[PDB]
Design a protein around this ligand. Sequence first.
Ligand SMILES: Cc1cc2nc3c(=O)[nH]c(=O)nc-3n(C[C@H](O)[C@H](O)[C@H](O)COP(=O)(O)O)c2cc1C
Ligand code: SF4
Ligand code: SF4
Ligand code: SF4
Ligand code: SF4
Ligand code: SF4
Ligand code: FES
Ligand code: FES
Lengths: 439, 156, 227, 226, 120
Amino acid sequence: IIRTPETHPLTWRLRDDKQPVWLDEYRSKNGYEGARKALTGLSPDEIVNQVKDAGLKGRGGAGFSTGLKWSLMPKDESMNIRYLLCNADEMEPGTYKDRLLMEQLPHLLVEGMLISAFALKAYRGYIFLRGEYIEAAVNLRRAIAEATEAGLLGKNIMGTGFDFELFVHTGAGRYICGEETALINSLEGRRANPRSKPPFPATSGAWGKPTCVNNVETLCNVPAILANGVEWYQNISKSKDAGTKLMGFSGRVKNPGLWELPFGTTAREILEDYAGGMRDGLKFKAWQPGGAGTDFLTEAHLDLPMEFESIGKAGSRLGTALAMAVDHEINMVSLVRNLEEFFARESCGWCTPCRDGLPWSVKILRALERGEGQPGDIETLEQLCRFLGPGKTFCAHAPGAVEPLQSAIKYFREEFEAGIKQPFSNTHLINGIQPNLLK
Amino acid sequence: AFELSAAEREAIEHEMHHYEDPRAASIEALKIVQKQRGWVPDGAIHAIADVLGIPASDVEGVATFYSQIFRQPVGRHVIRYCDSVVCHINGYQGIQAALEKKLNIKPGQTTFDGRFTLLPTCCLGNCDKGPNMMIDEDTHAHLTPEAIPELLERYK
Amino acid sequence: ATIHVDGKEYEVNGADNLLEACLSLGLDIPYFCWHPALGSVGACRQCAVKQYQNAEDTRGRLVMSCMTPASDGTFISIDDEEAKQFRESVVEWLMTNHPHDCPVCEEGGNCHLQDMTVMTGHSFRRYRFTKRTHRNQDLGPFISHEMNRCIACYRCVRYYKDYAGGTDLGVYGAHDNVYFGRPEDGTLESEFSGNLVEICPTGVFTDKTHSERYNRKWDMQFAPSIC
Amino acid sequence: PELAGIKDAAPDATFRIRGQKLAREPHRYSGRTAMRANISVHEPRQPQDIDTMFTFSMEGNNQPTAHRSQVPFAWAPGWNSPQAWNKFQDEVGGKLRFGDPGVRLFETSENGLDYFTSVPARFQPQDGKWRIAPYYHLFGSDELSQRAPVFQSRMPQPYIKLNPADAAKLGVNAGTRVSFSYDGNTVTLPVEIAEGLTAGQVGLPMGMSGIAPVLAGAHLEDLKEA
Amino acid sequence: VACNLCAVACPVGCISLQKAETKDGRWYPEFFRINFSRCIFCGLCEEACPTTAIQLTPDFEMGEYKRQDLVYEKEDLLISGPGKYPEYNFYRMAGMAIDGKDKGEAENEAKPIDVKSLLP
Ligand SMILES: Cc1cc2nc3c(=O)[nH]c(=O)nc-3n(C[C@H](O)[C@H](O)[C@H](O)COP(=O)(O)O)c2cc1C
Ligand code: SF4
Ligand code: SF4
Ligand code: SF4
Ligand code: SF4
Ligand code: SF4
Ligand code: FES
Ligand code: FES
């Protein structure tokens, strides 16, 4: 499938030989031209206004607009010490787009984050990459060397005079590091604990300085918006959400992978066209749109476009728009057990409900796996999910943790009741004491 | 008995001028010691605290918070098989059973000769080619239980 | 300021948080992670109250009273069923891994966790799985360590590091395996390490000098004196 | 008359809270008919307190709203922890209700002092004489605290602190026992090297056994290796 | 375990004891005395015992010649068997390490996981 730049402004310069694009080929295919336009004839506040007009939203899963985040910094010009972060952690399961992006296109991310720094007067930049991306780190370091030897980073960038430098910090294997405040805390060298709001990271981020963190996909969609105009970017997808998105399916399908699709595309159009359906003798039991932290959906929700507001009233979230399909052979009890086990062993453990209730749900699901369920387990799961909502915990990791649990409860309750076999026996008989027969 | 080498100290200092806070180089210093020795011993926490200036409690908390920084001694090669949801759909249970049959150990334990250490890990970013297994510099994909003895014999 | 607690009008300080304003009035709100001297971090999730936007609101919103400022005209409820259910659930989650140690614990009868378990009305156990255990460090001749009783409320690290300016007490590990103590065995080097026996709401840090010849708080003959 | 403020430090023995005294022990004080039963099965006298407003018994007052300032212990119904001080305060984290106990003897004077013109000279290290530098210890300086048996493991061993230059001059290393004579008595101590000390001084632990705190600021004679 | 719950639960206050600790860390009474001239035989101490150590037995013949000899010390109270509760042992449930029970060896307790362990 040929991806023209008119409707695919992100994946039109890709190579089919699985080889990275260096500085020469990137500069040949419209490299560092819009960045030159912004650094020469366009004010940083005008770039912020262009982002406002384009309606660029966050690609990390929250859906927050980039212009509102960029405009939340204070107007005090004395705070010149400013930091810009690229969230290349990709710690969410079921998401593999950033590895494929970084293995063949580092320079687009570098250019887009350079413009995002110039538009926000950010003097320092960091790419927070996960620690298991070895070849991605090697390619990123080689891109750093090639950009520094060409003058693209450092002092006197093409006569503009803007001082900027980028460093790459590798992760150390924790899922909670992906959150913005926790990424700021882990960048400072402390334990990756999130920070409550108030305060806000736009005011006091990294080391108290103004600091903004953007996703890799957002920082790669920025050059297309800046170079090919704003109204042209608005004229790509005709919906409430404007732009494109990296999309794809994974898990027991014919053609797993990554493609680029505009907003408003229905979820069925990736099944039989891009993925080509599943393997032999597999029934569509469930699917999950936005990685491990999103609600499961059924076949009735498959005919529904992948937007933010479209999934908003559907009882789920768009997430990273990298769905995963669960067939009839995989039981949902074991799947939810594995999801909650991941969310419990990779939780940060700050606040009481997630820290001391996710192991309870994990043990309940372990009992339901072995048939050792007891009457009072599913109700415990509902009570924990109700008491783990947005703001019921310290952050939003735990609402995303128990979104799959409540989704599998709502849609597949009959598979969970089959694990309840023995009656509720919490006490054991003590010889000499008559038990209190509760009714 | 611990002593940071000149190369390790130079690498830690080189990471230290990257950030404006010497505390920010704690994770990278721990990873440097991890690369240069294979694990972080008890004296390494105090050495990193002395070099950086932060207390040893902060370095110990950073080392014990992250899963990819090892505080207990491991073997020559570590095995980090993905056990997340997509690799569960792809069936990592057969891979884990084959690994436990070959190495004759438990997940989290090490072999008697220190040849391998069996560990689970988080998402490896390779869902489309699941299941995946992470050795020191390799991301093995499209795993089958029959190919596990063939894959484990190429590492010594 | 002016707050409406269960329909009753109360005059409080506007700069105070809601938990300290309600505690100053004699109203009982369960809390662990808040201390008057150490500030607030909102870890234990125990001080939930239902705040209403205006005078006539039905659903409200569950909020943390140690983060909520006591602004003028603030309508809250403490004894309504949703907030009590949430606080009982938080106490129950704290009680899942807590050891069966009250008779052989020096904090029995002097325990904040016992008081808040009783205050929330939680007395029936429905947890049947295993409970996590921890090895006990040696903290010297003054402080006795028992990490099974911890509820991960982060008051010790806050006091010892931020307040007391110590350097050899920290939190280690993640999720429910967080460990509070020194990196290795040794004496707590701070000159104010003894205040951990009152900062800690549980029996993790106990007076070892008292532990040698121990008696409960009700059996003690007290007098006000000067050191 | 300069100590005339100590009358207001606490009320006298006739002070009552609605007629009753202040209880020393809590309401659930136990074992009262058995704590002395091994000596005699007859219960003794409750000790009478003619000096203070307190009683050696249950029968008193410890209400958090009692109009008083001397609170023997914090206890409230449902608050058995040290968080009952919240009940005993007017506002939490503030003062004790009905005022904090204690009274300042003197107010701030209107007119101050004058500048002390006696500026001391520099410290000149003389040969043969060593200036004693006081090194106080939280466990070991107050005499009654050293008497406590639990402080004998927390206190450090008595080490005499020396400059590296002075240690080079005498030729003694760290840990070596050196003897010094003060007031005609020779005592030996092991040497610890202090880099932060200055030359011509010698560090000594004030308050320990044999080293009185009066030794601070005094000369020391015959510092030689034992 | 010398937890003093019986002594405070006694409405007459005729139980006196003191906590002592062995080298392995288990708790026991250094002494235990009951003033039986004061005891009303109400069974509140037995009801308040969390270890079922203190018990009231079917024995009424306790008449004495001297009132001082109605103070029963620990050597007169501790019997050779389990009494009316033959199987209960509190130290199988307590989460404090003694001889014969390390951490994690009590009922419904997992093995202690060190923070230096390799598991995620
Ligand atoms: C628990 C949690 C984990 C997250 N993990 C990642 C991640 O691994 N990679 C990523 O790019 N964003 C991740 N995010 C999203 C961002 O960290 C952040 O919440 C925000 O949505 C970023 O907005 P952006 O798309 O404009 O960059 C995570 C968010 C949460 C709440
Ligand atoms: S919800 Fe879980 S991950 Fe988030 S702050 Fe609370 S303990 Fe940490
Ligand atoms: S800390 Fe409190 S709740 Fe825990 S065992 Fe001790 S007295 Fe009981
Ligand atoms: S040891 Fe005590 S003060 Fe510290 S977190 Fe645990 S319960 Fe809180
Ligand atoms: S039975 Fe006797 S010793 Fe026991 S509580 Fe009653 S009066 Fe006290
Ligand atoms: S007899 Fe029972 S209630 Fe009394 S101190 Fe001993 S264990 Fe506690
Ligand atoms: S789920 Fe295993 S590589 Fe992503
Ligand atoms: S006291 Fe408010 S959450 Fe802890």
